[PDB]
Structures are given as structure tokens and as C-alpha cells.
Ligand binder design. Structure first.
Ligand SMILES: Nc1nc(Nc2ccc(S(N)(=O)=O)cc2)sc1C(=O)Nc1c(F)cccc1F
Length: 294
């Protein structure tokens, strides 16, 4: 705007443009997010203003929420790399399990905190997870779908990723549950392990059918009420669930068990972030430091 000398465009947020900027008056480097118009709900945004009070080591600190010119500016502490770039960087050898384990454990702590404060992220994806040289990983973005929602793209015609979207969202559920974040983190967990997106759908139905072909088409047995969902069709194909051992090798049984619980069809059966933190997969969790190329 003026108190900020844009350094580089960090990228394209699903609400606007994110810039790496420097506070010309404080000298601190931050991530500046400019929001997409004709006023925007001032009562809805209050949520955001409440997010400044959500302080946790695994959540990106929201330093400021500014309203001026129908442009909403969000100032976040700046982190040097997102998880997608890091995974791509490690694609050849894979992220080491101890690090995968540490990031998973930290993201769960972050989610446990948000969920206990009644905040849902709703759009977890590798690109929204930020890491530093210290070995920490933080939740960035946060949907803010109740105070904003999901556009016909993001802010300027851009292919929204559906890969980490929970089945109840794909089936037209209106009320989000904190369980949707768990599903997404589960997908991200499998992705770090295998170095392949778990459910790479390029359309809502393709996304849904990819989930079904892998976990089996859900029914009233495994998911009471599923046939009552808004977009459920009795015409959906009936795929048998695939053996889970083929889904995430060579993840051990502790990891597979935790993953199956994070990917339970029924949201009420899906494990919470708090219980997952107590899962035996984390008995030997540590905090390695990643090899970061900045
Ligand atoms: N605070 C913050 N720091 C970032 N750093 C950063 C990100 C990616 C790379 S990369 N691609 O690895 O070179 C480097 C640095 S993005 C970001 C944020 O909060 N971002 C942000 C936002 F403002 C609103 C919605 C989603 C977001 F991810």
C-alpha cells in the first residue's frame, strides 16, 4: 500500500494475491495478503479479527487485519517455504519418516488447538502448510468460508484443488465439521509418505469416485445417513474397498492404522486431532530439522 515495499509475489491465495513484503516502518518481513470488492461483510470479517488472538506455535501468526478500499489486507508473519515446494524438492528421495512424523504431529497439535477454539481450517493443502529452518510447520490460510466461502475459482480464474477435500463436502454437506480438516491432513500424510497425491481428482465427481474406488463406495453400513446426503445418487458405482496395504506402502502398521482412522467415511467415526495425538504412531516422535534450500 505504501508502508509496505513489496518484495516478491509469494503467489496466488484463494482469496487474493500474497506478497512477500517489508514493513518500511518496522523493517520486519511479512506475508501480505490483499483480499479480492464492493464492501464485503464487516461482521463476517470480525472472525478474522478474532483469528489474531489464536496464538499457537503451529499456526501462522496473523499480525494484522486491515480494511481499506474494499481491499482487505491481512498481515502474516513470513515463513520461507511451503510444504508443496519442500515435498517436490524431496521427491527423489522422499521426506524422511521421522520428519514426516514430526510434521504430522505438529499439524495435529495445531488442528487440536484450532478445533478446541472452534476454528476450522477447511482448506488444508501442502501449499497452505509453511515450514521454517527450525523444523516447525505451521497451518496457514484457513478457509474462512463462513466469513467468506469458496468462489467460482479463487480470485482470478484459477483451478481450485479438490485433492484433500473430505467426502461429506463433496456430497454437498452444508455444515462443516472439524473432521474435514482431519481428512485433508490424512490425505497430506499419505502424500508425504508415498510422494504421490492420494486422491488426485480433476472434478468433484472424479474426486469422489477416486475416493470410492480406493476406500470402497460408502453405504449405510459404514456411513449411517450417507444415502441422505445432498448430492448422493443411488446410481453411484459400487466399488469394493481396496486393501489398505496397497495404499500407503511402506508406511508401518501404526501409520496405516492412524491413517485409516483419519480417512473414515463417517465424520463421527473419523478420529479427532486430540485422539490422533495419542495414537501409538507418535510414541517415538521427535523434531528433526529439515534440509531447506532458500
Ligand atoms: N505467512 C506466509 N509466509 C509465506 N511464505 C512462503 C510461502 C511459500 C514459499 S515457496 N512457494 O515455497 O517459495 C515461500 C515463502 S506464505 C504465508 C501466508 O500466510 N500465505 C497465505 C495467505 F496469506 C492467505 C492464504 C493462503 C496462504 F498460503
Amino acid at each position: 500500500m505504501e508502508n509496505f515495499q513489496k518484495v516478491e509475489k509469494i503467489g496466488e491465495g484463494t482469496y487474493g494475491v500474497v506478497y512477500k513484503a517489508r514493513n518500511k516502518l518496522t523493517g520486519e518481513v511479512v506475508a501480505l495478503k490483499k483480499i479480492r470488492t464492493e464492501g464485503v461483510p464487516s461482521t463476517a470479517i470480525r472472525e478474522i479479527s478474532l483469528l489474531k488472538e489464536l496464538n499457537h506455535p503451529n499456526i501462522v501468526k496473523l499480525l494484522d487485519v486491515i480494511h481499506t478500499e474494499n481491499k482487505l489486507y491481512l498481515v502474516f508473519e513470513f515463513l520461507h517455504q511451503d510444504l508443496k515446494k519442500f515435498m517436490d524438492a524431496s521427491a527423489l528421495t522422499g521426506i524422511p519418516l521421522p520428519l514426516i512424523k514430526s510434521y504430522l504431529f505438529q499439524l495435529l497439535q495445531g488442528l487440536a488447538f484450532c478445533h478446541s477454539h472452534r476454528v476450522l481450517h477447511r482448506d488444508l493443502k501442502p501449499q497452505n502448510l509453511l515450514i521454517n529452518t527450525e523444523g516447525a510447520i505451521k497451518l496457514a490460510d484457513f478457509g474462512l468460508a463462513r466469513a467468506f466461502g469458496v468462489p467460482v475459482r479463487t480470485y482470478t480464474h484459477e483451478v481450485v484443488t479438490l485433492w484433500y477435500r473430505a467426502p461429506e463436502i463433496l456430497l454437498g454437506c452444508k455444515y462443516y465439521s472439524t473432521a474435514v480438516d482431519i481428512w485433508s491432513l490424512g490425505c497430506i500424510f499419505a502424500e508425504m509418505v508415498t510422494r504421490r497425491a492420494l486422491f488426485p481428482g480433476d472434478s468433484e465427481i472424479d474426486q469422489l469416485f477416486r475416493i470410492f474406488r480406493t476406500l470402497g463406495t460408502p453405504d449405510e453400513v459404514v456411513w449411517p445417513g450417507v444415502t441422505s446426503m445432498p448430492d448422493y445418487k443411488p446410481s453411484f458405482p459400487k466399488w469394493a474397498r481396496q486393501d489398505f496395504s496397497k495404499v500407503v506402502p511402506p508406511l508401518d502398521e501404526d501409520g496405516r492404522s492412524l491413517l485409516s482412522q483419519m480417512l473414515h467415511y463417517d465424520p463421527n467415526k473419523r478420529i479427532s486431532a486430540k485422539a490422533a495425538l495419542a495414537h501409538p504412531f507418535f510414541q517415538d516422535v521427535t523434531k528433526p530439522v529439515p534440509h531447506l534450500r532458500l
